[PDB]
Each structure stands twice: as structure tokens, then as C-alpha cells.
Symmetry: none
Subunit: 347 residues, 4 copies
């Protein structure tokens, strides 16, 4: 689908949303603004008047393709912009993933029984207690009444999460970053297996905390989950290099936010178009193209002050792609002397 | 015990203190002053300049029979000037009687043992959850650890005191006034059984809120409590009519604060001193005399502008009693020639 | 007018209300209950369910003569059941007499001007402050904005009441009880002189704190105020002896609450009736009757266990009055020997 | 300065610390660890067992060049990992920069003097009120006394900070990201002018939220601040592309954390060492070299599975630089026979 995000003074920011959505581009401020609105809109933000200033004290809106309003309640929104947010989703508090997950687990005839036995010891502590505080005068009596215990209450006050390696506890912070994400995704998995409600999960700032190899592991996991839970949607904000993943399925949901806003087309479609414009008969392979596309996309639709360092082939693809979007920027042929020598030296 | 209470301009106010001390008399202002000093002195009042101004900015003192200072810490003071005061003493808050009694009981096997079970049951819930909880990534395992459930936690979040008649709660305000008083005394009984430290309880304004019949019930209860606990002392401020109690054991502590200060003596002793001046050879029985005392005492040592309405017998006894205290005031024979017809009218 | 106060299980308590209303009687519990409802009803009490228990969880009501509901907002209610309540009415807080009074005083072109000068020094402190915290970056600026001062604010935080004698401050508590009442009435006077809204003031527990002479001074003051402010109403709960004031104007508003509830009739009406029943030709003077009526009224409609000590004449009037209310109780002729001697001795 | 940061299983992590220190490189996890320890060690973290488990329950340490412990108190730490962190440093709350600067200023004649006037004006309001206030009874007088209005009271109840553009307030979130950073630095400037104590400021994750152009502005500002204040130290964690700055003065403090740890050297020095192995006699100018460094450095000391896309010149320089650090990885000449047609395509 599509999100048409309200902008304080310009047209709406268009976003082509899919199971796995990726927002990239050189316009970092705009990306940030888009993230701020998204989290506020779907996150339950209670707006102050200073928050609505830029929108003329009117609450900001997000429209769909038909230009209808996308309800703020439309998704079970989870924002992960730091590992701290991740730890918070695994603690038993109001609205966290853990709350919904642990409530499903605790709910079992097996456990419920222990609650009854616990409330029996309570009813005993009460009685044995009233026997010593015999405040009775006529028809009147002064005594303590007990509010029976609930599991929600127990989970909220007497239980805490811990992480261990072969039974040795270590703080969440010291848990490997990739493991942090995996544990979170696993919890999300078990929860989604018992709900049809829509879940929208936003992830930014993580690329910098894990290697390109670990990220690939994390990305396969989210791909697995979206293919398993139709009701799940991911919105990622990949770094400029080594994290953006492009394939036939998610291609159209790669949104480029630079000097202009556009989303990619289908890969096969673009391959053929680009191939038609390629200045050589030695067309790149579909895979070589796909990778070139992953490298350059973050730099499309951007008139740049400094030419990004790129291979000859990626520079060409970049130029051609820009043209397909009618964007004028072009990487100009390097002006370095004795290229033959540098080339040979790289042999 | 003798209390020589400091007065802003005259000689100290002499009070004869006993287990059940009663302050009665027509000098309402002096009585009010005495109560004020008593509650400030023993109530741990923190004096301000304004407070001490009437004393030359020096802290006031109460001296004993030997002219020594009666330490402000010698008693656990409890001022009952309204029913709201009784209630505060029964709410479980640091400093109250209920709270102090609760402490010397909540920590006793009879209950501490049940905690074992409650917590053992918690460890069982933790184990059952950790089995169904299946979040392992790499060598990391996510699990919940229980935090032992304490008694204080139980009392705070799962216990609330209530006033009820046959399991039907009602606000303290609706509990009959005599019962409010009885509950307070039973509470006090419990607490005193656990300590030998001295307690001084001041009661004022309660007379107007209960029947004379009820007060008798209340009076006997405190008479009991005082017999049972030598460390308990009561200071009452009875109304002019129907509340003052004169008996062989407390008469000595009935203080009259009117135009002059004075305490009563041994009942039999007064009975004999008064009969020496009685106008008839047919004396009132000791019981009748004792009854007149309770009626007349609040009006002794008072030069009254408006002669009080009293039966013929009480008036004579009032006069003789003032004489024995070398007080001038005498009730003047209101002679009416139809005396015979009125009496015949009283069947 | 009339107040028909709701009772948990019996007919409504009837009260004949007038400028100066007096509630007396031997049924102290009922008097107390009536007071509790009155203060809750007109005092703005927010009812808990335990409060409404006795009324079947339905809010209690007070009806007028026509049996219509008397609005809880109908009066500016002030409850004085202790000198502490009096001090509280003289402090500047939400809803106290002082708040309404000081707001009228502070409101003067003369004072308002000093507020402006104060806000000018504020506007200066702000500027001189922003000059040192020059947080300015582009069109943006970070600075402190001032919320201008208000007198209500000043009165609430920088002003406090004090009581002095020839410029020497003493705490309110040490101020003579009669003075406490006088100062309060004076403040009430100045306030009422600038409002037509109805004021209902309830006073109980004070009789015990001042002499009969002082009370007379206080009573003349309230009589002055009700004759000056048609919109003012007083409800007093006098003690059984020496405080109840009866005259032609307030007679009908003296409500007797004992084994039964009735209000007195007009004085001249009762004088004639009683005179018709008097067992002698030596009828008492209208004044002698009025005083006898002040003495006995608190004991009417009361079957008593112990005969109250009264003069022969007051006992007769008491008996006759009871009969006029069809109440059976009767003081029986004393059985004391040699009354002639006791009478002579009183000469 | 040298930091030898403790590592759970390998040799300490060596960091070359300078006024503007930069940590870059492909080992995202190691970098994340380093940031974590730095903020815990200097941020006054209170360690728990779980926290210290990876260290054998011993508190981790940072050693200097002489193997001595760098005290955890040697710096006033400020961790900027998000914009919310900048804001907290600008809210007036004990511990922040704004609060610390406010203190060293609010107490300076320029303002203290205006207080004189404000209060003098209060005494005038008190006098004017005490005249119109007319409550005297007996020798008692009721009057109001003012409590001096302090600066702290003014700031607390009559002052609130605001972000605004031409007197129009807006939420911190809507202030352009580059401005958020500038405001923070101006604040920091003010505070540093008032102290010589050492400050260590860590910045992470900001690159992705602002343009490369803006960051340059930001970088020059901190370059200024550091020149102005020898007690200020910055530790940045730049993205792989477009943020790392290499100059004559800070190059020495650019730390590369990848497969190996290492810091760069004097720029000219490297320029000469690299030109000794350059394949062409036509060397890149010092400026060009310096430009390649900023591009290539984040990828040094890394055995990459996916060869990075780089211009021909940057690739050669990358290779030589790895050689000079005795690191094996070399970028392999991606030869394509149509090399000529592609270049001609790049105009
Ligand atoms: Mg970028
Ligand atoms: Mg009296
Ligand atoms: Mg009575
Ligand atoms: Mg990387």
C-alpha cells in the first residue's frame, strides 16, 4: 500500500509500503522527519500545542492510496531506534511485546492452579491476622480484607527477565547485538503465532551496531517472519552502504528520499530498461545488476557536491538509473592520469 | 502525680493527676488553655516565636510535686478531641496504635510460615514458565527469575482495613459513636498488652456526641483498662451535666477549674465534713451524697451571675462544699409562697 | 423554612430553620448524625460507596416544606466545629472566607499599580537573563519566557496572617477564644457587605471553650449580623445548660432533638398555654417564664433514667411543656425529709 | 592520551585520544562495545553482578600509556546518542549544562538588584492591605506579613524555557537537526567559559540524521570549541561514508577498529610513505590524497567478503595503506574489456 505523510509546508511524502519496506536516501533530515511523524502517529503520541505548531495547531495526518485517512490505531506499533528500546519491549510493562507474550504463557491450567494455592495462603494470612486484631464491638467489626493476587500482578512485581549463557547471567547490554535482535524476533514470532492483528515494526540506527554479515542473518529472519505472518510489516532505514537488500519481492518498497522522492520499480523491469541504455554489449548479469542497484540506490536523485567514490560500472548504472527517473545528476568520468598503471597495479 | 502547669500571667495551675483524671469547672477558657499546653507539651509540638511570645519566648514547663520538670517525653500522648482523632489512631500509618500493634504481630510464625508456601508456589510458577518460554539464540537464553514476595508487599498491595456489619462495609462515620469509642479502646487494649511504656490519653468534646447511658459503658471500659494497665493514664474534660463520675478511687483526681483551682478529696471524708453542717438530722445516704457531688461539682468555686437551677438538696450541698473550700458563693433561697401547690402538682 | 433531613431507616429529621437556628436535645447521637449529614450535604462531600452504604448506595437528600430538594449548592457553607476550622477560614486557601475577603481588598487601583511595577522588574530579570543565555541559531532561539505575577499568586505564596497585641505577635491559639470568634465574625461582616449570596454557618463544640458571659457577647454579634444581612443563616448546637438563647424572634427555630423531634412555638403562645396549666395563681413573669424555658428546653421530650436536678418551678414548667407536646415524661416531687429546714438554711 | 580499554577476552583496546577523537571501522560490534564501556566507566554507572559477570565480577578498567588507571572521575561525561540526549542537556534540571550555567549567573547584581525593587514593592502592597484590613477585637489585630520573594521561586513558578522562531514556540523535535546541534554547542560554550574542569563528549548516531553539508558546519563549530577550551574532548563515531574528517591536527586521533586496531599518523607522513609505492609517477596532490583517506579509512584493516565499490584511485590508496599497516587485504582489479566505452559514457 501507500502512506502519504503530511509535511509542514510541502506535498505529502509518498511511501510505498510492503511486508519489508526500506527507506534510504541522502536527505537525512527528511528521513528523520518521516520517522518522527510515523512514530508519533502510530505510537500514540499525545500532542501538545507546541508539537502542532508547524501544522497550524492541527493534528498531522497520513493518507492511503485512495487519499483516505490511515487510522492511528491501525497497527500494533513497535519502534526500535536503539537496543534500549529492544530491552524495553522484553520487560513486562504496559504495551510491550513481553506483556502480550508472557500473558499468553502464564495463562495455563497448570499455572493458574498455583495461583489458587497462593491465594489460599493469603486467605490464611488474613484469618490468622484477624484473630489477633479482634476489633469487634456489637454488630461492628474492624478487619483487614484481602485483594486476591493476579498473575498480571505477579509478573509486574515479582518477576524479571535475565539472560544467561550456560546458566551464567550477564546483563542484556553484554549480550551480542545480533543475539539481542534474534531474541527479540523470537519473542515476536511466538506472539504473532497467536494473533491476526496487524503489527508494524520500525527499525533504525541498528546497521551501525552490527557487521554486514550479522545483518544478513537478521534480515533473513525478518523475511521468514513476513512470509509466515501476512499481518506483519517492517519499515527499515538502512545506511548508505552494505545494508540495503534488493530482490524481486521487496524492490518496489525501497523508497528513495533525496532531492526528490521515488520508490524503485520491479527489478526485471529496471534491468531491461538499463540494459537498453548500457553503453556496451557486455551487459551486466542480472545478479551483477542487482548488486550494482543495491550499491547505488541510496545515492539516486541527489545532486551531490562531492562525487561518491564508485566503480566504473556502478557509476554508469547510477547515471542510467537517475535518467530513468528524469533526474539530471551525473557522475563524470574520473580525471586521473595513467589509469592503465593503477589498473595493472590492482592485478 | 501533681502537674504544676505554667500560666502566662498567674501562678502555675495545679492538677492532681491519677489513672482517670477529670477536669471540670466553669472557667472554660482556663480549661481550654490547660488542654492546649498539655497537648503541645506532651504532643511534641515544635514551638515558634509566636508560640512562645506569651512566655517571654521561653519554652513553657510542667513541674511535679517536687518542683522538678516533668519530661515532655514521659508519655506516649494521644489527643482525642474529635472522632476523626479516634480513626487516625486506627489507620495503619507509621505512628498510630494499629500500626504499632501490627508490627509486634505480623512477624510471628503463625504467619511467617505461610509465606514459605506462597513463595515455594512462586518458584513453581517460574519453573513452569521457563519451560514454556523458549527463547534461545546462540548460547544466550532468556528466562524469568522471581523476586520473593514479602509480608510488607502483601499488606500494602493486597490488604485494606474495613468497618463492616455482617460483611457489609460502611464508613467509620456511620459506626455508632459509642462503638467508635469501644473499637478505639479495644485497639488500645491490644497495644498496651505489648508494652509497659507510659500512655497519656486526653478526651474532650465526646460527651455531646453520645448519650449519658452510653458514656457510662465507655467509662467502665476505661476503668477496666486502667486497672489492667498501670502505665495508662486518662485525662477527661467532662460537660457540666451528666458525665462527671465520682467514685471512691478517682474522686481525688477530679479537678475543678473555675474562679479557683482545687481537686476533690476522699468521698467518705467529704461526706462526713459536709454532714457536720447539714441543716437536717436526716442526712442523705452516702449514695445520695455521691450523686449530688457529680451534679454540683462542676459549679463549685464559681461566683455565678445567673444562679443555677438545682433541687433543694443539691443546692444545700453546693453551699456547704463551697464553704469547706472557703469559697464565698452561696445559692440564695428562691422563696415562693405557693411551694405547697407546686409540689402537689409534681404528683 | 424547613429542612427534612434523610435518615437511614426512619422518617426524615424535621428542622425548622431561621436566621438563628438552635439544635438542642438529649439525643446526642441523632444531633451528631444531623450535623454529619448537614456538613456533607452542603460542604461538598464526594461520597464513596462506603459512605452511601446506609442509604442503599443512593446519595442522601434534604427536602424543604414543599418536599422539594434543597440544592447542595444552595449555600456558601462554613463549618466551624473547632477553633482550628476558624483559623483555617482566615487563611488564604481555596474556598475559605479569607480568600473571598482578601480578594476584595487586594482589588484596588492603588494596589494593582504595584503589581504592574513588579511585573516590570520581572520583565527586566527575564531580559537581563536572556542576554546571558544567548541560545540563538539561525531563525531559532532558546529563551526563558515569564508568566506574569498575579495577586492571587502573591497572596497564596508570599503572604501569611498574623495576630498581634500592640504590635507583638502571638500565635492564633493563644488569642482569647472570644477574640477568635470576634475576629472571624468581623471578617465575615466585611465580606457579606459585598455579596447577596446565601451563607450558612454551622457552629458546634464552642460552648465548652468560653464562659457563659463571653458566649452572650458572641451571640449578640451574630444577632447583629443576621439582622443586617438577610442572606445570613446560623445553625448552632448549644450545650444543655447556660447557652441556649430564647426570644420572640428565634423561638420557633429552636429544634429539640430527643426521644422525639419538635421545634418550639412562639413564646407568647407558650406562655399563655403554660399559664393556663400552672398549678398556682402566682404565675411566673414573662421573663421568669422565658428563662425557665431556656433552662428546661434541652430536656424536653426525654424519658430520663435520672431526674435532672432542677428548681421546683423549672420542674413544673418542664412537666407542663412536655404535656403540650403530648410527651408523657414527668419530674416527680422530690422525697427529701425536712425540706423546711433546707429551705431556711438557704436563707 | 592513550586509552587501553579492558576487553572481556582479548588484549585491551588501544585508542589514541585527542581533542577531537574519531572511532571508525568495520568492526561494528567492537565499536559498540567500546562505546558501552566508555559511557559506563565515565558515566558513573553503578555495576551489578550481571554487569560485571563478563569480567569475572571485577570492575573493568581503562589504562593510560603508563599502564595506570584513568580515574572514572577525570571527566564530566556527556553521552549524545540521540537528539533526546541533546535536549536533556538543555532542560534546567540538576546535573545538566543549562542548569549549571544558570547557577553561575542568576546570582549577579545585574539581576539580584531588581529583586530589591520587587520586594520593596511587596512591602508596599502589605502596607496598603493592612490599612484597608480592619480586624481588631480587644487588643488583638489581624494583619498580613509578606514573605520575601526569592529568585528560585520566580524561576520555578514564573519561568519556562521555549524554542521559538520569531516569538512562535515549537517543540524541540521540529527545530532543524543541525540547529539542535548548534544550540547544544552554544550552550556548551557558555558553560565552558565558566570552568576549567575536563569535559568528555561522545557523539554517535547523529550522521544519519543530517546532511553531509550540515555536518561540516557542525564539525567546524566543535573544532572552534576545542581550540577555545583545552579541557574539552570530543569522541565521535562517524559513519563509513562522508563524515570522517582528516586534517593535519586530528588525523593522529582517528582510530580504526576492524579486524585489527590502529590509529592513523601525521598526514604528510602517510602521503610520503604511500607515494613511495604509488604505481604512477604522477602522484595525487596532497589534497586529493587527504580526500581519498577520508573515503578509504573506514574500510582499512578489514578482510571483506564483498569487495567495496571505489574509484580506481581510492582502491590503489586503500591497498597501499593496508600494506603500510602490514594488513593482507587487497582490492582485486575488477577488469572489464569495455573499460573504454564506459568512460566515454561518463562524458
Ligand atoms: Mg548520507
Ligand atoms: Mg459552663
Ligand atoms: Mg445531655
Ligand atoms: Mg559497516
Amino acid at each position: 500500500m501507500k502512506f502519504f505523510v503530511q509535511h509542514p509546508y510541502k506535498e505529502r511524502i509518498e511511501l510505498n509500503i510492503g511486508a519489508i519496506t526500506q527507506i534510504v536516501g541522502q536527505n537525512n533530515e527528511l528521513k528523520y522527519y518521516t520517522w518522527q511523524i510515523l512514530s508519533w502517529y502510530f505510537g500514540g503520541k499525545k500532542y501538545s500545542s507546541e508539537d502542532l505548531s508547524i501544522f497550524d495547531y492541527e493534528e498531522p495526518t497520513i493518507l492511503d492510496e485512495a487519499r483516505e485517512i490511515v487510522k492511528r490505531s491501525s497497527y500494533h506499533y513497535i519502534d526500535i531506534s536503539s537496543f534500549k528500546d529492544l530491552l524495553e519491549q522484553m520487560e513486562y510493562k504496559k504495551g510491550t511485546l513481553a506483556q502480550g507474550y508472557l500473558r499468553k504463557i502464564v495463562n495455563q491450567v497448570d499455572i493458574v492452579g498455583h495461583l489458587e494455592k497462593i491465594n489460599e495462603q493469603v486467605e490464611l494470612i488474613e484469618e490468622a491476622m484477624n484473630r489477633h486484631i479482634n476489633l469487634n464491638c456489637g454488630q461492628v467489626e474492624y478487619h483487614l480484607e484481602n485483594l486476591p493476587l493476579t498473575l498480571d500482578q505477579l509478573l509486574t512485581k515479582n518477576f524479571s527477565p535475565f539472560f544467561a549463557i550456560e546458566n551464567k547471567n550477564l546483563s542484556f547490554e553484554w549480550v551480542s547485538n545480533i543475539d539481542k535482535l534474534s531474541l527479540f524476533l523470537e519473542m515476536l514470532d511466538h506472539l504473532l503465532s497467536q494473533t491476526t492483528e496487524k503489527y508494524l515494526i520500525v527499525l533504525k540506527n541498528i546497521d551501525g551496531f552490527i557487521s554486514e554479515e550479522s545483518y544478513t542473518i537478521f534480515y533473513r529472519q525478518i523475511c521468514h517472519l513476513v512470509k509466515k505472518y501476512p499481518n506483519l510489516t517492517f519499515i527499515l532505514f538502512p545506511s548508505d552502504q552494505g545494508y540495503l537488500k534488493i530482490d524481486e519481492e521487496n524492490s518496489r518498497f525501497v523508497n528513495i528520499l533525496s532531492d526528490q522522492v521515488e520508490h524503485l520499480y520491479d527489478v526485471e523491469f529496471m534491468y531491461e530498461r538499463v540494459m537498453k541504455y548500457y553503453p556496451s554489449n557486455d551487459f551486466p548479469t542480472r545478479e551483477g545488476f542487482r548488486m550494482s542497484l543495491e550499491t547505488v540506490t541510496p545515492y539516486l536523485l541527489t545532486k551531490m557536491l562531492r562525487q561518491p567514490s564508485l566503480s566504473l560500472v556502478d557509476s554508469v548504472i547510477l547515471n542510467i538509473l537517475n535518467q530513468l527517473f528524469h533526474f539530471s545528476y551525473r557522475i563524470r568520468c574520473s580525471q586521473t592520469p595513467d589509469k592503465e598503471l593503477l589498473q595493472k597495479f590492482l592485478e
